[PDB]
Design a protein around this ligand. Structure first.
Ligand SMILES: Nc1ncnc2c1ncn2[C@@H]1O[C@H](COP(=O)(O)OP(=O)(O)O)[C@@H](O)[C@H]1O
Ligand SMILES: [Zn+2]
Ligand SMILES: [Zn+2]
Lengths: 654, 283
């Protein structure tokens, strides 16, 4: 029947496709030996579980062919399309030529290579996954694209399967789980195997004996399956949600789904900027059997590579150049105050507060008792003060620069939005939990505004969080002691807006010292007019609004990428403190304790210095030592710590 | 040479090695592992246990790590716990009878031959919760540490597939083969030939005992953004009424996988396999 399924032809020629691919697999020498064959040798050594595909190298070999007068036979223009078919062709090409194992197989190794040699479709003979990664356009510009950062709404429909790069934010990803790719059916009588292949969501088992020997046999002895011979591969799904600035006017964004497998399942975590790459493929769903016209398809995407502009603290390994960046950073000098200055230069002054934020970012040092207890190397700050002065630029910059950051309002969804939730997972029946704003932050930073307007529930939660890094819940199925390990940074305003110079801070402020005691630091930022300072204050504001470029000082504040690199490097150390500084710290603690208790019980008096004050001083001195990058503490740091502590409230006396 | 298909485990060689290690182990770990009187660490348990008629025994991993001739047994009991333990269930009785040879005893032999034996490797290599268990490392001896939330009822399982022929005053017996029952439709042709005339009765058969325990995982390290999880497992007979809510636990077992039905109507399954754990010991 030529009518149905009639003939048609296209420029595609698999004959030369395969030849070109296989020649590339072996001709690579521009960047051991042929490093591609060397990585194949590593795979023979059972070193990795997923090959890496570089595409600009394919472009470069096409350049080689062009320069040598050969028909370049550009295959990338087709690989950008229909990658789902080219994956199984590249796998076949690799399987065709796999080098031999330079090392021997022993009892201490992967338990799969032994079986592979024991029995030594082609899918079950594959010991290497594959995960592409698209080019970076910076080099596609060199010599002269296809995939730019796109949106959850700009799919356009026609992009089903092409090469794409979509950005956004991951909200919820299920836990990794196994998924079959090839079945292992062994015969009871024939003693021969069978390969049942499944690629859809479901299937039906093969029970009756259709074995090849049973074919020439009256009897058809039953067969069964294996739990180790049958192939397997992981399967995990994620959801993107569109970035804010690219949403059209008054338009509510929408969602999307992706599918993942095998190796790269671990490179995703909710709440981070991401640039997913892969191909957008369909799936068998047609609405639900009443609002249907046929041919409808629910859809998904393929995950093959992850790059994110936000580098978590766990990616820190030095190289031949980043140490050079650190070196040239530290050579200039005045690094500490220079950091304090570069922290959010959009606002004016308050170098003390920017420094306090820097030390909040640093966090401190972790110490373990070893007797069934540890202590947090963590900081908690507040910036009490009247309105008018800048308050939210700090928090917004902190969330912009610090990773694992979070922002929340004061009132609204604080009832459970800051706490554990209960939900059933889509891709599998299970009662998974996703936490509130605090929980999405961990070993990171958090921000809060208008703390006085929050609920007593929020106060109770943050009270427990500040001193202890857990959380307790006794509402429902959740009966957990959840780990927060978060850094709190709140802000609010007095009861009367502007300060009450005739009343003490302990009365003007609305928060109780029963909770504020845990707040190791506290600034009172209030404003009084002065003829001269406001001159250049207006100068600064007018200049920054004339153009975003901050004042043209002989100084260059640096990118948050470099700042996070530096903070990650500084987080590696764990310095020590001598007795020469310990005794001075003890003397200063006694001085402050007695002075504040006996004298400061009056107008401008706030409570009293505490053991938590001493612990915070120690933690901040440790942070100073970490910044200096020395494993010891100098006497030249406690002076700075106490200077800032007593300068935090200098304006209370004017 | 004797070997198992797709395996590097020997029955008699492993038996001899096990017997040699059993006869030769005297706090070797106190010497090799560290600097820290007694003699023949293991042998006392086996000497004492005989008179009390118990079909159980515990076992460490550090002892095999210490003794010279058990390092390879380490990875072999690791990768193939059930098979290695089925070998050991025979090797233990072999050593028992080879050790009674040096003794004259009252006639207690009526029990040991009919007896069975089983082991319980408890203190083993550490595992990092369940996040580590990508499908590469399924069906292996494992350890964990968590608390208990929920306990389920007893699950019976077909262990002796009794059968009742409709005529000729004859019963019938058949056992399970890798977890299924194939009813012989015939009717003992000799006496009577009805190709599909037989019945099934439940009261006759024998049943197994199984439980399911919901557990909360409490690791020592977690990634950036972790949260508590719940897991299910399966214990079997002689371990019922052992663990329940209100107890912190360090446990051992074997990670596994299994599919589930799409309904109570036909045999169509899911491309994704629900995971679980089968117990070996509880501390
Ligand atoms: N020192 C300053 N320089 C420039 N702008 C400022 C300064 N202080 C306050 N502002 C402006 O005044 C506004 C005050 O808002 P903000 O302090 O962020 O929150 P709140 O209204 O709760 O105090 C900001 O939008 C900011 O642009
Ligand atoms: Zn067959
Ligand atoms: Zn009969």
């Amino acid at each position: 029947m030529s009518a149905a399924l009639p003939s048609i032809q296209l420029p595609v020629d698999y004959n030369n496709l395969f030849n070109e691919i296989t020649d590339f697999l072996v001709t690579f020498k521009q960047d051991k030996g042929p490093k591609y064959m060397a990585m194949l040798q590593k795979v023979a050594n059972r070193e990795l579980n997923s090959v890496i595909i570089d595409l600009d190298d394919i472009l470069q070999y096409q350049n080689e062919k062009f320069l040598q007068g050969t028909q370049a036979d550009d295959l990338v223009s087709a690989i950008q399309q229909n990658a789902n078919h080219f994956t199984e062709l590249f796998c076949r090409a690799i399987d065709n030529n796999m080098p031999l194992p330079t090392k021997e197989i022993d009892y201490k190794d992967d338990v799969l290579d032994v079986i592979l040699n024991q029995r030594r479709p082609p899918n079950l003979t594959r010991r290497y996954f594959l995960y592409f990664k698209p080019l970076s356009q910076n080099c596609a510009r060199r010599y002269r694209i296809s995939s730019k950062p796109l949106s959850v709404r700009q799919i356009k429909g026609d992009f089903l399967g092409q090469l794409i790069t979509v950005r956004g934010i991951i909200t919820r990803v299920s836990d990794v789980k196994p998924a079959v790719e090839v079945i292992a059916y062994t015969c009871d009588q024939c003693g021969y195997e069978v390969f049942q292949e499944v690629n859809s969501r479901t299937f039906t088992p093969l029970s009756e004996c259709t074995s090849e020997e049973c074919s020439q046999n009256q009897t058809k002895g039953q067969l069964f399956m294996s739990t180790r011979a049958s192939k397997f591969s992981a399967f995990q799904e994620c959801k993107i949600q569109e970035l804010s600035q690219q949403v059209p006017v008054g338009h509510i964004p929408r969602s999307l789904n992706i599918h993942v497998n095998g190796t790269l399942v671990r490179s995703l975590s909710p709440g981070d900027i991401v640039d997913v790459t892969g191909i957008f493929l369909p799936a068998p769903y047609t609405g639900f059997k009443a609002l249907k016209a046929g041919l409808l398809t629910e859809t998904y995407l393929e995950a093959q590579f992850v790059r994110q502009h936000k580098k978590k603290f766990a990616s820190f390994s030095l190289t031949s150049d980043v140490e050079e960046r650190v070196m040239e950073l530290i050579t200039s000098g005045d690094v500490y105050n220079r950091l304090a200055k570069s922290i959010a230069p959009e606002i004016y002054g308050n170098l003390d507060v920017k420094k306090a934020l820097l030390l909040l970012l640093v966090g401190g040092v972790d110490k373990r008792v070893g007797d069934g207890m540890k202590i947090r190397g963590d900081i908690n700050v507040c910036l009490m003060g009247d309105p008018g002065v800048a308050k939210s630029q700090l928090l917004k910059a902190i969330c912009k620069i610090s990773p694992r950051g979070v922002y929340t309002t004061g009132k609204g969804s604080s009832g459970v939005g800051l706490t554990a939730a209960v939900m059933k997972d889509p891709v599998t029946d299970e009662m998974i939990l996703e936490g509130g704003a605090l929980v999405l932050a961990d070993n990171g930073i958090c921000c809060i505004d208008e703390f006085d307007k929050m609920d007593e529930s929020d106060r109770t939660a943050i009270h427990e969080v500040m001193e202890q890094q857990t959380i307790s819940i006794s509402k429902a199925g959740i009966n957990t002691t959840l780990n927060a390990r978060t850094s709190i940074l709140a802000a609010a305003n007095p009861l009367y807006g502007r300060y009450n110079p005739r009343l003490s801070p302990l009365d003007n402020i609305n928060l109780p010292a029963a909770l504020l005691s845990r707040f190791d630091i506290l600034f009172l930022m209030l404003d009084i007019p002065s003829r001269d300072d406001d001159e250049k204050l207006a100068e600064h504001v007018t200049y920054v609004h004339m153009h975003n470029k901050q004042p043209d000082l002989d100084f260059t504040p640096v990118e948050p990428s470099k700042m996070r690199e530096y903070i990650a490097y500084a987080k590696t150390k764990r310095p020590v403190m001598s007795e020469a500084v310990n005794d001075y710290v003890v003397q200063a603690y006694i001085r402050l304790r007695q002075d504040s208790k006996r004298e400061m019980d009056s107008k401008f008096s706030f409570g009293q210095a505490t053991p938590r004050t001493l612990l915070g001083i120690i933690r901040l001195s440790q942070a100073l030592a970490k910044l200096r990058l020395a494993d010891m503490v100098d006497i030249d740091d406690v002076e700075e710590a106490l200077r800032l502590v007593r300068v935090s409230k200098e304006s209370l006396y004017q | 040479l004797r070997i198992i298909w797709g395996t590097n485990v020997s029955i008699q060689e492993c038996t001899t090695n096990f017997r040699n290690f059993l006869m030769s182990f005297k706090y070797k770990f106190r010497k090799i592992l560290d600097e820290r009187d007694e003699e023949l660490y293991y042998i006392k348990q086996l000497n004492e246990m005989r008179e009390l008629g118990t079909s159980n025994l515990n076992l460490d991993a550090r002892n095999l790590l210490a003794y010279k001739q058990t390092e390879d047994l380490y990875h072999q009991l690791l990768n193939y716990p059930q098979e290695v333990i089925s070998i050991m269930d025979q090797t233990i009785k072999d050593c028992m009878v080879s050790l009674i040879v040096d003794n004259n005893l009252d006639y207690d032999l009526d029990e040991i031959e009919t007896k069975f034996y089983k082991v319980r490797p408890y203190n083993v290599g550490s595992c990092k919760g369940m996040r580590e268990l990508n499908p590469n490392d399924i069906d292996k001896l494992i350890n964990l540490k968590g608390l208990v939330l929920r306990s389920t009822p007893v699950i019976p399982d077909m262990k002796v597939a009794f059968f009742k022929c409709n005529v000729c005053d004859h019963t019938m017996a058949v056992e399970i083969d890798r977890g299924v029952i194939q009813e012989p439709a015939r009717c003992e042709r000799i006496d009577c030939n009805e190709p599909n005339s037989m019945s099934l009765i439940h009261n006759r058969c024998s049943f197994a005992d199984k439980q399911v325990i919901k557990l909360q995982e409490t690791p020592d390290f977690v990634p950036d953004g972790q949260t508590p999880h719940s897991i299910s497992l399966c214990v079997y007979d002689e371990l019922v009424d052992s663990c329940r809510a209100g107890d912190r636990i360090e446990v051992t077992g074997t990670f596994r996988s299994i599919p589930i039905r799409a309904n109570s109507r036909q045999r169509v399954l899911k491309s994704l396999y629900k995971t679980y754990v089968d117990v070996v010991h509880v501390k």
